[PDB]
Each structure stands twice: as structure tokens, then as C-alpha cells.
């Protein structure tokens, strides 16, 4: 955010960020540091069911998430709906915060 601003190039490009954002505030703070888009993976993975057992390289996923094996994949209970919910919350949680700061957007 800074440098690009310092070279007057900062309006030429949009900034996005990702890394462990799990929460409304996590997102607001990112924005204030200068971001305009936020990336959400793991947490969206977890909502589709990851239980954070770290055996992604192993192809033994308890839950059909990171695995090519068939039998295992049948254990998957992910839902568009679930994910959609995840985002839906985060958002509302964001608007909640903004209105806290007195900003409407």
C-alpha cells in the first residue's frame, strides 16, 4: 500500500490479501491497512468440514476434503450452503464493526 502510493501507482491496481483471515475484524483491519479484497480458504475448507488434522499430503482425509481416494471421498459433507453461510457471516460481522466506527461502508 505504501510504496505503490509513494509512486503514484496505487490507483492503478487493486490490492487483495490472504493468510489466516478467520473473522470480521481480521477483515476490517486488512482493509484499513489498505486491502480491497480478502481471500478466504482454510476457513472455507473447515466449513466444508476440514477438522485440521494435517494429513493432506497423505491422501487419507477423514472427510473427503483433500483426498483423491474414492472411498474416502465418500465421506464428504461439504455444502454450497455451508460456505455461503461462512461468507454471509463474516460480512455481517464486518458491517457490524463499521457501524461501530461510524462508517457506513
Amino acid at each position: 500500500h505504501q510504496v505503490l502510493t509513494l509512486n503514484r501507482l496505487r490507483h492503478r491496481v487493486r490490492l487483495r490479501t490472504d493468510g489466516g483471515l478467520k473473522t470480521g475484524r481480521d477483515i476490517v483491519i486488512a482493509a484499513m491497512l489498505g486491502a480491497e479484497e480478502f481471500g478466504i480458504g482454510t476457513a472455507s475448507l473447515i466449513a466444508m468440514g476440514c477438522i485440521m488434522v494435517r494429513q493432506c499430503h497423505s491422501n487419507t482425509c477423514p472427510v473427503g476434503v483433500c483426498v483423491q481416494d474414492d472411498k474416502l471421498r465418500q465421506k464428504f459433507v461439504g455444502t454450497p450452503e455451508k460456505v455461503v453461510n461462512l461468507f454471509t457471516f463474516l460480512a455481517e460481522e464486518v458491517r457490524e464493526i463499521l457501524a461501530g466506527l461510524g462508517f457506513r461502508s
Binding site: 489466516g20 475484524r25 481480521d26 476490517v28 483491519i29 484499513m32 458491517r95 457490524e96 464493526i97 457501524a99 461501530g100 466506527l101 461510524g102 462508517f103 457506513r104
Partner: peptide, 20 residues
């Protein structure tokens, strides 16, 4: 656990209604 964690968020405007 993480730097953002060291930051509070104060602001100088008074609160607006969420609906807005």
C-alpha cells in the same frame, strides 16, 4: 498471537445504525 492482535480500533465518529 499475530500482529493485528496488537491493534485496537478506536475511531472519532459516533456510531451509526447497522441498517445504514
Amino acid at each position: 498471537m499475530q500482529l493485528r492482535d496488537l491493534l485496537e480500533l478506536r475511531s472519532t465518529k459516533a456510531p451509526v445504525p447497522v441498517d445504514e
